[PDB]
Amino acid sequence: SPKALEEAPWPPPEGAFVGFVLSRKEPMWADLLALAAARGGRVHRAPEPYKALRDLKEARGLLAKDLSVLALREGLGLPPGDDPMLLAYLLDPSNTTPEGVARRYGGEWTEEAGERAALSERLFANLWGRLEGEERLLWLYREVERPLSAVLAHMEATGVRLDVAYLRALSLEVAEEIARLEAEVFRLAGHPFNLNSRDQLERVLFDELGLPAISTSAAVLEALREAHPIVEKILQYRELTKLKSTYIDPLPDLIHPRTGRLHTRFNQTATATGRLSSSDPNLQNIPVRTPLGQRIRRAFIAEEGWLLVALDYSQIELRVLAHLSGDENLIRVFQEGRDIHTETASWMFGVPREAVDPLMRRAAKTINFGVLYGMSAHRLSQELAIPYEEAQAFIERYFQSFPKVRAWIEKTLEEGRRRGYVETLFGRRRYVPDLEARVKSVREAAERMAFNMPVQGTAADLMKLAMVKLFPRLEEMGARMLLQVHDELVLEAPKERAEAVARLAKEVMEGVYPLAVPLEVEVGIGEDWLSAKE
């Protein structure tokens, strides 16, 4: 596009598609280098991008949310609107990058604003064509997808406070521990060496101590945690070095000069299953309930005079597994408020009711978690200390107890082979073409994703639908939605009403959609992310 005489004076008419180029960054830190709009065959280019911002009523076009971030920094209430990226993601979730989308649905996404604006216009008409004939996919767009871009616009622009005194004061502590570990690694091999150097580590392992190999073999350390105590200590050095270098020492260098907060980038077109994602920092890989990963959570604090409110969905994937299954026995564990891990152990072992167990329940949790994606017997054995005789027979005790779960898995794989895709409760779908693939490594993979996608995906949609419904109501209480990770949402509310916001959030989240099983929401009010844990 466009042809004839097409440049026009700024401003554009309402409903024009915006295009923008930012300075090679992420929006709360970037400069608006160029802005333009396309409508009806003509393109409007901004004289000066920042003053131009105030003429748009809404940002509609590719990556609309990232212009709302920039625009909230500056202090403008510019909502995001139609975004082709969201159409293309609903069409097929492997559409993750605008570069990807441009190549599939005709287009070349380039570094020039009027050009990104014209592409936004075409792709919206193309993609919306493809979609009005899809009831479930339109609903998701109007009721979850486009409302969520508003919430993510605010979450990302608002930010979370950090406690830099403590982050500095945690760096030396973990640095000290790296020192003791390294002293151990040293009077265990004999003399000092550079743990961070491949030649020296090959020499000490495969020559000086004579450990068995010729990293070198495959990724030997991950496999040789059985010979000397040292390979254990080496891995502990390597993971504490990774945590020090990615979530303690970087984190004060991302606090923002103008706001004083960290600005996590929230992406909603990144994961396979429709779950949100974080970028700098990537919150999902902070080890949860582990001393170190809890030590990092103490660093996120509320503003002086506010309280954090963290809310968590209890067993969201087993609760949606009982609903999509139809399993009377899994439904009744939660409908009567029973501990799924005890009750599973009761059924599985048939021990006269719930009595003199404990061990049975550790085996019950391990099958419970392991079915969720497909924990094979030998893995089941390696985790839950058994051999490959009881191992198989426990997969089968689980499905004698909860047999419609197997019905559901056999159903969904059959439906996945025929239809060519699986779908969440709401209609979001992932295409699984490899289910018949005749190469074992990949066909098993397709079958993990086909069963995972209805569970994880529905868990996602419920969290997503609970956020768009909660956002308006928190606004008229003065509260703010800050962070979303795994199945948890973190709010900030002033002290004077932290109690009441906690009440409303829990209530909207447990009642988001009528399921066959009660959704449970755990809520904690505290001055930092770790104290709110309750």
From Swiss-Prot:
It catalyses: DNA(n) + a 2'-deoxyribonucleoside 5'-triphosphate = DNA(n+1) + diphosphate. Residues 121-534 are annotated as: Polymerase. One of its GO terms (biological process) is DNA-templated DNA replication. It is an enzyme of class 2 (transferase). Its EC number is 2.7.7.7. Belongs to the DNA polymerase type-A family. In addition to polymerase activity, this DNA polymerase exhibits 5'-3' exonuclease activity. Unlikely to have 3'-5' exonuclease activity due to absence of a 3'-5' exonuclease domain. This is DNA polymerase I, thermostable. The chain holds residues 290 to 832 of 832 of the full protein.
